[PDB]
# Entry
Amino acid sequence: TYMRSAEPSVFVRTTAEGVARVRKSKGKYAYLLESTMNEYIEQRKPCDT
Amino acid sequence: LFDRGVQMLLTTVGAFAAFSLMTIAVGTDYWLYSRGVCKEEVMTHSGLWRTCCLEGNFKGLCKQIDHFPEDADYEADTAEYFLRAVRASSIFPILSVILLFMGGLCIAASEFYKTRHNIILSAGIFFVSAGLSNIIGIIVYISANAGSYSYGWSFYFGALSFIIAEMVGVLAVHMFIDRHKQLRATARA
# Structure
């Protein structure tokens, strides 16, 4: 129910903008993505997740 | 340390020098030398309100200090907000300026109505409080810095204005001891 009450909407239309909000939050936003994709970015650039 | 006229003159000239140095320090935008932007990262000289470029493509175009930056400032705790408020408003440098001016007025006005024996003690307390306010302001500014750099001359202008104020405050209260000491000497005889 929190994402229902999460104003502004935490949902992301595309998977690129989902990580984009993460790198612009500096630890203030968490992203729920596939585990296989998650292991990519944590080693991909900019190596901050 | 000897006589009274010179010691009066020394205290007054020290108070005026401290006031002038500290007023210059507050009003000068040369406090910090660090790499930054005046609109890519480049050498910048900062103060409390504006920070311009050095060795840049344009020279001398400062902006207002980003005390509360936009675009996801991330906020912070109440203590960090308090510290940012003190650094932005510069309440302690200005408070010290006011106390130094008040003490200078008190010592200047002491030549009128010599009988009132608490005006000099008031000036000494004002100068000592101004020195303490200088300490607090310097500390808060350096803490806000840490949140290759070197400090500008105006920061050292305000650093010596604390030393002068305490050395003036030390003398000013010392005058209160001796001039009250004369009261006992003339009462005994």
